[PDB]
């Protein structure tokens, strides 16, 4: 029950979502020897775009802060209850990646404005085990893509994705992967950088921020 | 009723008698009290017969349901937890008399040492559980006699078969000192039931083997 | 605009659904000597388009993953409860095929967007019994069709359906039916293939995936 | 910019008519032993003829999921009613009535009208004499009392006329089957769904006629 | 009340007496306690008369309802389950005194051996059930006398008719030792009712046959 | 209270006394306890006066309501069922003391033989019912004396009038041996009430006929 | 059961025995009653075993949950409050017998003086709490003997190790005068468990250290 062709309206919605995604700070996530590395261009000191989700599952996002932030909270919520019901090692990056996509699709179909967000869920292996890091990208519609090496979110993704395509090296150390990620992100200054890792070597909680003087020394 | 379970190097064995009573009256001569809930766990349940068979059935359903949804079985820890939550749920009815206590035997495929991956777990009416570490457990009206028998006989356990014989003997002594536990009926040919779990899963011991062990014990005591 | 021709909106919806069905990976299911064979073109290693539904009932789908995946879950749900209430041998491929169709029709009529999905429910006989494999195809509107030999879903179905029409042979072994199915599907590489069977010879759970080295040896 | 309601109603009627037209044809006719349903049905699992209650049968033509759904609703109502009062209290008339009211209300409040055409049949009980009753319920809620035969779905004119020439009251089962298949052609042993409401059965009158026996009869 | 059921080669037979009391007072001389719930199962119910007749009626309705919806009868296992669930549902009222216990006889068409496709199933007040395998069962106030009679008379059972005679005799002894069970009334001509189930379904034994068997027994004891 | 009902060839008759008490105190000398619920059924109700009159009224309403909706009266079976369901509904209050028991007499127009189309039906507090087949029934505090009287007097019943006289006499003996049942009051001229049902429906017996029968009995006993 | 906790200059120590009983029967020889709920708090729980382990688990979950949401742990005051609210919530079940009392030891990183940043907090069944300031606390059936031991031994506490020895001794006297508290089992090699918290967090004392201290005490008393 509406005038403007529904298909046309859907196309307009997609265009609006694309525009929202485009005008945003860029984030990258890439696999390196010790796990996964998140490097985001973030000027504020209070507002963050990278977060722990569960013991070995991390999360980065790009778009509208209140919404991506809201998903952050929803994701945190689901994991704790699930773990309490069954156990910590039962929550996986895959299940979480799935939940966001379904929620996003349903929400978009029944809501007014689509979430101008782009998500990346990351997972590493547990302590004393061998397994490759897994990166998933969830887009605004509900689509989910399995990435083997790196994810780039928000802003103009082409130049960063290509620079990473030339510079990426599996089993790069933490410093090399940081140089590659900052370099491809430039395609900056010590200030306004949000850097965190999913260090596979930690016993339980793998997420760990790299801020201040140590970061400066590394760079 | 009486259900014993004991670890042996490389596996676990779980055996149960066959009698079911109402007061002093013998009502069932061939009940099966030990189920194979999954490829690596068997569950015995002592207590009210209805609540028992229901527990076993529903728990098997739930294990397999999560397995179908997630594509991988729970860890032995998760299984322990779900069984515990069921048991805790029956507590109100257990105070009203419908008490059912489970004894859970499993073989952990993820354990480090295969020779000690066997697992025995015991529950109380309030859902608390305990991982047994002295090598054996039992439940039911004959449990005390069975445990006091296995404490002495347990140094003889060296493999799957010796462990099976020790199980059958423990049952024989339970029945020998308690009237609610049935012994091997030589007349009708009804013997305890047994399940063996090792690296290759869970299999029911075929009746003939239990028959021979029981006849050996009975002739030893004469 | 306001007052419009329903018959036009409905036609537009049908066209949209058709387009959605068309741009998707192709799946085939065919009867062979040991039961039913599902062969799908699937690059991902985590996302699957073939699934066990019940002891002897399998399921393949083509379209939008979140939706067909959602139906997968709904179908799993119904069978377990039904079996618990009555029994395992009471759940049949027919009842399940029926449920999806009714649900799809009602859902489409009351929802916003139609499920761009195409379903195939398969059933084989129990252990130690003789009966022909049954294939049902359920389309996005609720239509259900009884197939004697093979079902082809998603993408361009004409060339695959014709190649199968020439190559199909009843009582073909597992290897021959696999060659026929991969060949008609090409109308590929060892990687990115999702292959499973409903092996009628298994005692209880008939569904069984064929992956890795064994699959390579077979092909 | 609004359109109209009467025009919309006319469009709905046309759509319903089109849906009814593109479907397999079913016939039901009275014969000596009761009522005979003969439908053109290729599938072996999907059926368009069904028992409703002890002496009440049911045939339909249109969209399978919907007519099938009515089938289920009708089965539901009879059992509960019988349990509350008794088996001999449920009649073909009450059931025929329920479907019509439901259909009308449903059409008025729903989105799409049920592209279905129903025929409810009833015969007398054991050891009693009474003429078979046929009712036809259309998509809007209209109900018509038929003395001899009902034809549903597809092009109904040629079949209805062929039956008009061939019909004979108190025809045996074989003759009524020949007449019904002949007028239906206006076919092959395969893809035929044939059932009877045999008035001679003690309780459950509905009885399917399938396979070798049917082949021998034809 | 007393209802016996026994398997014979090729079928099952189920018979029940006719008395219904209130305390010491004989209130019904011709109650029918054995129903034909379907073409292959008969159901006897002992206990409160209201709850009994209601159980029988509703169960028959449910069996036939699923049959009409799905186009095929449940397996004997499903039938057993539904009856059990009904019985479990009446438990609250059974503690209040409205207890009704069913004994279910059926002929499994899907069983492998036709000569042993007969089936007898017994229930307790808590819905648990048991598949009888010693060849006979009974329920009601006279059940113990009836079972102790059939234990001795059961080697005589070789066909449908001998099995019927054994049933009638077991009833006669139940009534002979318990006052709540009515025997054959020769004065009014009221005899136990019987149902026979075999490969061809369930039929009521016509009264004359039961009359002759009862007169034969009565003359044998004089 | 006492209400008798007896079949005679071709019909049924139903009579009831007139007293209503509170303890030892006679509170009503002319209560009417037998109603004509419809053209072919009369209903007597013993027990709490309120619950009784209410039952009768509501049941009559329901019979006639279904008749107006469906255009045809229920069969005698349906009527029996509805009355039974009402009675079962009052069970909670009957345990609290508000017990009311109905006795239902009807003439089945659909029965095969007109000479035996009469019908008598009795109910207990739990809603179970029984179709009487020994020819007569009664309810109330005097019911045992009334039945024991009719057992002897019943061979005299050959038509409508003799059946009526037997009814009145049975009432006279009930009252003669029980103090809660009133006999014919010759002083005030209050006699039992009676309803006759046959092929032509239900009519109230006019008082004069009952007066003459009662005076004949009373003079016979002097 | 008995769980002692005492501050020492620069930290806090918390130790607990290993026995768990049912009446007079020793049921668990190696239960762990002291948990590390977080990097700066350990929690002991006396009382019903189920309720105890559940409290510990859930409280740890809640502390860490708020920490993940807000990016900073609660202050020691907030932690005290949440534990108190849980305890107050179990009050209804504690009156029914499922009582569980926690003793909470923590090291306040925000306190002014590091040498006295240790914290001991005790709770009653009604959720009220009290910050202990005489240097030590205990809970369980042996708590009175343990406190009366520490009152005398506490002047010896000068560092982490002497404080640990005093803890173990207090436990030894609790067990020495109460039968529900287990002492060091020299035969099976099972010793009390201990947790030490100081500026660097919470660590479990490795078993060997507790073994040596226990053997020193036992030889001192001989």
From Swiss-Prot, chains A, C:
It is found in: Cytoplasm. The formation of the proteasomal ATPase ARC-20S proteasome complex, likely via the docking of the C-termini of ARC into the intersubunit pockets in the alpha-rings, may trigger opening of the gate for substrate entry. Interconversion between the open-gate and close-gate conformations leads to a dynamic regulation of the 20S proteasome proteolysis activity. Pfam families: Proteasome (PF00227). InterPro entries: Ntn_hydrolases_N, Proteasome_alpha, Proteasome_alpha-type, Proteasome_asu_bac, Proteasome_sua/b. GO terms for biological process: modification-dependent protein catabolic process; proteasomal protein catabolic process. Transmembrane segments: none annotated. Coiled coil: none annotated. One of its GO terms (molecular function) is threonine-type endopeptidase activity. Belongs to the peptidase T1A family. The 20S proteasome core is composed of 14 alpha and 14 beta subunits that assemble into four stacked heptameric rings, resulting in a barrel-shaped structure. The two inner rings, each composed of seven catalytic beta subunits, are sandwiched by two outer rings, each composed of seven alpha subunits. The catalytic chamber with the active sites is on the inside of the barrel. Has a gated structure, the ends of the cylinder being occluded by the N-termini of the alpha-subunits. Is capped by the proteasome-associated ATPase, ARC. This is Proteasome subunit alpha. The gene is prcA.
From Swiss-Prot, chains B, E, F, G:
The keyword Cytoplasm applies. It catalyses: Cleavage of peptide bonds with very broad specificity. It is an enzyme of class 3 (hydrolase). The active site is at residue 1. One of its GO terms (molecular function) is threonine-type endopeptidase activity. Pathway: Protein degradation; proteasomal Pup-dependent pathway. The 20S proteasome core is composed of 14 alpha and 14 beta subunits that assemble into four stacked heptameric rings, resulting in a barrel-shaped structure. The two inner rings, each composed of seven catalytic beta subunits, are sandwiched by two outer rings, each composed of seven alpha subunits. The catalytic chamber with the active sites is on the inside of the barrel. Has a gated structure, the ends of the cylinder being occluded by the N-termini of the alpha-subunits. Is capped by the proteasome-associated ATPase, ARC. GO terms for cellular component: cytoplasm; proteasome core complex, beta-subunit complex. Disulfide bonds: none annotated. Its EC number is 3.4.25.1. Component of the proteasome core, a large protease complex with broad specificity involved in protein degradation. The gene is prcB. One of its GO terms (biological process) is modification-dependent protein catabolic process. This is Proteasome subunit beta. Belongs to the peptidase T1B family. The formation of the proteasomal ATPase ARC-20S proteasome complex, likely via the docking of the C-termini of ARC into the intersubunit pockets in the alpha-rings, may trigger opening of the gate for substrate entry. Interconversion between the open-gate and close-gate conformations leads to a dynamic regulation of the 20S proteasome proteolysis activity.
């Amino acid at each position: 029950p509406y005038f403007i062709s529904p298909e046309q309206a859907m196309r307009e919605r997609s265009e609006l979502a694309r525009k929202g995604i485009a005008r945003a700070k860029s984030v990258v996530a890439l696999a390196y020897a010790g796990g996964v590395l998140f490097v985001a261009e973030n000027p504020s000191r209070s507002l963050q775009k990278i977060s722990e989700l569960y013991d070995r599952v991390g999360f980065a996002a790009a778009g509208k802060f209140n919404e991506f932030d809201n998903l952050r909270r929803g994701g945190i919520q689901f994991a704790d209850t699930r773990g309490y019901a069954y156990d910590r090692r039962d929550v996986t990056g895959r299940q979480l990646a799935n939940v966001y996509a379904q929620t996003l699709g349903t929400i978009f179909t029944e809501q007014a404005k689509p979430y101008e967000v782009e998500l990346c869920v990351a997972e590493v292996a547990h302590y004393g085990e061998t397994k490759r890091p897994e990166l998933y990208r969830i887009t605004y519609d509900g689509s989910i893509a399995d990435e083997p090496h790196f994810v780039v979110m928000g802003g103009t993704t082409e130049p960063i994705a290509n620079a990473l395509k030339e510079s990426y090296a599996e089993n790069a150390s933490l410093t090399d992967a940081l140089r590659i990620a900052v370099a491809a992100l430039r395609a900056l200054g010590v200030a306004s950088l949000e850097v965190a890792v999913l260090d596979a070597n930690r016993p339980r909680r793998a997420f760990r921020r790299i801020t201040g003087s140590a970061l400066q020394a590394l760079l | 009723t009486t259900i014993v379970a004991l670890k042996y190097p490389g596996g676990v064995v779980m055996a149960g008698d066959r009698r079911s009573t109402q007061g002093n009256m013998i009502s069932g001569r061939d009940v099966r009290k030990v189920y194979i809930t999954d490829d690596y766990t068997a569950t015995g349940i002592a207590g009210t017969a209805a609540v028992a068979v229901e527990f076993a059935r529903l728990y098997a359903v739930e294990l397999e349901h999560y397995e179908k949804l997630e594509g991988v079985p729970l860890t032995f820890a998760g299984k322990i937890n779900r069984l515990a939550i069921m048991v805790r749920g029956n507590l109100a009815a257990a105070m009203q008399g419908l008490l059912a206590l489970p004894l859970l035997a499993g073989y952990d495929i993820h354990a480090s040492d295969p020779q000690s991956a066997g697992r025995i777990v015991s529950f109380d009416a309030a859902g608390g559980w305990n991982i047994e570490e002295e090598g054996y457990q039992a439940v039911g009206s004959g449990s005390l006699f069975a445990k006091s028998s296995m404490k002495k006989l347990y140094s003889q356990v060296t493999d799957g078969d010796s462990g099976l014989r020790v199980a059958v003997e423990a049952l024989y002594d339970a029945a020998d000192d308690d009237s609610a536990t049935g012994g091997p009926d030589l007349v009708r040919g009804i013997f305890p039931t047994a399940v063996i779990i090792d690296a290759d899963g869970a299999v029911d011991v075929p009746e003939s083997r239990i028959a021979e062990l029981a006849r050996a014990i009975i002739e030893s005591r004469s």
